Write a protein that binds this ligand. Structure first.
Ligand SMILES: *[C@@H]1O[C@H](CO)[C@@H](O[C@@H]2O[C@H](CO)[C@@H](O[C@H]3O[C@H](CO)[C@@H](O)[C@H](O)[C@@H]3O)[C@H](O)[C@H]2NC(C)=O)[C@H](O)[C@H]1NC(C)=O
Length: 318
């Protein structure tokens, strides 16, 4: 949990405010408030996901998940809440991967080749074991549901990118195709030219989102987590209260008057020994290995999202 403990909602009726503060959105991300809001607008779902458990107790496919152990490594959905990308509503043509335990799940999200698709359920519903249907569920009637009903597939890390010229991305695009000549179409998105294809098959591939019209999938590739101590590397909470507001957090990150930990004070400035009563804002280093930088096709890329997920990939016929 980056900031806020597992949410304990009393109501399904409660509205989900949109908060401007970085920490505020991190807090909602912590309490899976963003999935709950994804569910409300798209599945006409009633209430919340992540009850008592929050984002840490979300279920991943696979369960043995690296980046999960790092609370500030952003999933596609957190990234969506942070506006970095958008997890699009499930359309009929987006393919549900086999593998995960979808039954019970009210929400599961998957990186497609072209983006990120969510499959949500209506109130009092939950996915069957296949994931292709929301069947009725008495366990979901309360509308305030546990985190293991949310499923994030893929070991995904999302992060502020360094944009790359399109010529660079086209180099990477074709480098992948020379690495993956076998594949013809991924998530309904044409990868190569084949004419003779086989029907969609699963595909465990590492990949990165470079901010372009699709991801680049990588067989061989090097990564190097580097620490940046940028302001997004810190969240700002009020002790006992929750996250600082939009202005309070900006003040801590610009002026250098709020309290913090070892690295936050080194970087943004803080003061110690003041007080008089009533405790202050504080900021702390988000826990993550850093910003991933990926060596691939001779290019050092700092991507929007890096992950190893399962997509569906059609193959050729010889
Ligand atoms: C579910 O529906 C919500 C309503 O559309 C939506 O929340 C809305 O999110 C957008 C995008 O973040 C916000 O848009 C604008 O907000 C401020 C001004 O208020 C601007 O500064 C921004 O630049 C942006 O243009 C809406 O304010 C916000 N509305 C409400 C009532 O919360 C959610 O995003 C939807 N759910 C998901 C998962 O996307």
């Amino acid at each position: 949990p980056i900031i806020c403990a597992g949410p304990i909602h009393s109501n399904k009726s409660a509205d989900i405010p949109h908060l401007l503060g970085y920490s505020e959105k991190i807090c909602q991300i912590d309490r899976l408030i963003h999935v709950s809001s994804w569910l409300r607008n798209h599945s006409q779902f009633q209430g919340y996901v992540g009850q008592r458990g929050g984002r840490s107790q979300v279920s991943y496919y696979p369960a043995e998940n690296s980046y999960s152990r790092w609370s500030g490594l952003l999933s596609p959905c957190d990234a969506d809440w942070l506006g970095m990308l958008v997890v699009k509503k499930a359309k009929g043509s987006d393919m549900i991967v086999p593998g995960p335990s979808y039954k019970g799940k009210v929400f599961f999200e998957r990186p497609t080749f072209d983006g990120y698709v969510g499959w949500g359920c209506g109130s009092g519903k939950s996915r069957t074991e296949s994931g292709e249907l929301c069947s009725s569920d008495s366990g979901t009637s309360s509308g305030l549901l546990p985190s293991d009903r949310v499923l994030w597939i893929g070991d995904v890390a999302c992060q502020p990118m360094t944009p790359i010229p399109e010529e660079t991305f086209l180099e990477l695009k074709s480098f992948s195709q020379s690495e993956f000549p076998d594949i013809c179409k991924i998530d309904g998105i044409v990868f190569n030219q084949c004419e003779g294809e086989s029907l969609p098959q699963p595909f465990d591939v590492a990949w990165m989102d470079v901010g372009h019209s699709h991801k680049i999938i990588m067989r061989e590739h090097k990564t190097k987590w580097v620490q940046e101590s940028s302001s997004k590397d810190f969240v700002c909470y009020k002790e006992g209260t929750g996250p600082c507001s939009e202005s309070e957090e900006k003040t801590c990150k610009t002026s250098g008057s709020c309290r913090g930990d070892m690295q936050f004070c080194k970087v943004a400035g803080c003061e110690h020994g003041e007080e008089a009563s009533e405790a202050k804002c504080r900021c702390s280093l988000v826990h993550k290995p850093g910003e991933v930088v990926v060596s691939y096709g001779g290019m050092r890329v700092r991507p929007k999202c890096y992950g190893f997920s399962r997509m569906m990939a059609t193959l050729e016929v010889n």
